[PDB]
């Protein structure tokens, strides 16, 4: 099989490119515990609830007295950077709140305790966050109350509240590329595609597939679903679903009988998905194409060190000059180690076929335009122009 990704390989960064002496949270939750953007590395740490934010240039040993973000009163369960502001991060906590933070470029004098805004809509833990890809200041949360809330961060207003659309625990919620639809996984063992503005499930599995449990699901660029989960016999699975025919997967890859939820990291430009879970020492990666069997194993980056979490650098942070197509931020017990994925062209020329124009830091829509039903594609930028800072510095509430 001819693949331009045949020779994609991982390499650990040099020891002095690591972030050392960071107490990674050991709370039992299946989120990645790590959010990275082109400026910052954010990690959920052993605390109440706390996370650390490090400028990417500040490699080596983190000072014992390095300031933390500590506004929450119970463990932090999820963190997500604003796609349209590289100094804004949202945190979700077991305390039932979401806090949205203005991160300084400098080191503050003490712990950051005062967010831009606190969002109080859930009656139970908030373990899922996802910023809207195109609509300014729009933020999704999903809680242990099985409610999905879509917020306007700028006003603190609830735009949409999807209560009781799931009969049991919601494991994951993903936007599609233009933020018109949601994909969800549920403890009732079924996938759903939801139109949040219609308040309707538009596609669902009538019943579980051979008693399998989906725990994560993301959209492919063409609107199919990639799910991860466990078979009836506890075999970890990657599946590709056509939501127009939800009764049989297009493709199913069964792997090992390990315990950890596999997190899918999907590259829509390469059509590559990387899988790894808490406790895994490896990163396994696959190409998705319309040639059968559609899901194509490429390779595995192996190590002797189980991960405690994993960050994934957005496109605007990749080193295009080195044909870096992904950068993982692997969490160990006490450190964060970058792992670089390379397509080895051995060329000083910008590789356009690897780096098509990609969503930039400018929103395509205002919150009210999106709520009124407008759809737009993301505003694309070129990665050849280097780092282009967001127009917005301070998110004003």
UniProtKB/Swiss-Prot annotation:
Domain of life: Eukaryota
GO biological process: actin filament organization; cell migration
A single MF term (Gene Ontology): actin filament binding
WD repeat coordinates: 17-56, 64-103, 114-153, 157-196, 202-243, 248-288
Keywords on record: Coiled coil, Repeat, WD repeat
Protein name (record): Coronin-6
Organism: Homo sapiens
Taxonomic lineage from the root: Eukaryota, Metazoa, Chordata, Craniata, Vertebrata
Gene: CORO6
Residues shown, of full length: 7 to 405 of 472
């Amino acid at each position: 099989r001819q693949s331009k990704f045949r020779h994609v390989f991982g390499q650990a960064a040099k020891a002095d490119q690591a972030y050392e002496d960071i107490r990674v949270s050991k709370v039992t939750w299946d989120s990645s515990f790590c959010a990275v953007n082109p400026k910052f590395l954010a990690i959920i740490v052993e605390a109440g609830g706390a996370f650390i934010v490090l400028p990417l240039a500040k490699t080596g040993r983190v000072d014992k007295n390095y300031p933390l973000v500590t506004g929450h009163t119970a463990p932090v369960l999820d963190i997500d950077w604003c796609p349209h502001n590289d100094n804004v991060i949202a945190s979700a906590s077991d305390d039932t709140t979401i806090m949205v933070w203005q991160i300084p470029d400098y080191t503050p004098m003490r712990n950051i305790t005062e967010p831009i805004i606190t969002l109080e809509g859930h009656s139970k833990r908030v373990g899922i966050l996802s910023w809207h890809p195109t609509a300014r200041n729009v933020l999704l949360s999903a809680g242990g109350d099985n409610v999905i809330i879509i917020w306007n961060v700028g006003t603190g207003e609830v735009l949409l509240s999807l209560d009781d659309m799931h009969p049991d625990v919601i494991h994951s919620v993903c936007w599609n590329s233009n933020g018109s639809l949601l994909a969800t996984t549920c403890k009732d063992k079924t996938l759903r595609i939801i139109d949040p503005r219609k308040g309707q499930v538009v596609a669902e599995q009538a019943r579980p597939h051979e008693g399998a449990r989906p725990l994560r699901a993301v959209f492919t660029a063409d609107g199919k679903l990639l799910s991860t989960g466990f078979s009836r016999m506890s075999e970890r699975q990657l599946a590709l679903w056509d939501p127009n025919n939800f009764e049989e997967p297009v493709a199913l890859q069964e792997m090992d009988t390990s315990n950890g939820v596999l997190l899918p990291f999907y590259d829509p430009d390469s059509s590559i998905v990387y899988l790894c879970g808490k406790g895994d020492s490896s990163i396994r990666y696959f190409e998705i194409t319309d040639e059968p069997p559609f899901v194509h194993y490429l390779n595995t980056f192996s190590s002797k060190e189980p991960q405690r979490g994993m960050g994934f650098m957005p496109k605007r942070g990749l080193d295009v000059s080195k044909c870096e197509i992904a950068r993982f931020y692997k969490l160990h017990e006490r450190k964060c180690e970058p792992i670089i994925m390379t397509v080895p062209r051995k060329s000083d020329l910008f590789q356009d076929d690897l780096y098509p124009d990609t969503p930039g830091p400018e929103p395509a829509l205002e919150a009210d335009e999106w709520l009124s039903g407008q759809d737009a594609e993301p505003v694309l930028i070129s990665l050849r122009d280097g780092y282009v800072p967001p127009k917005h510095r301070e998110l004003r509430v």
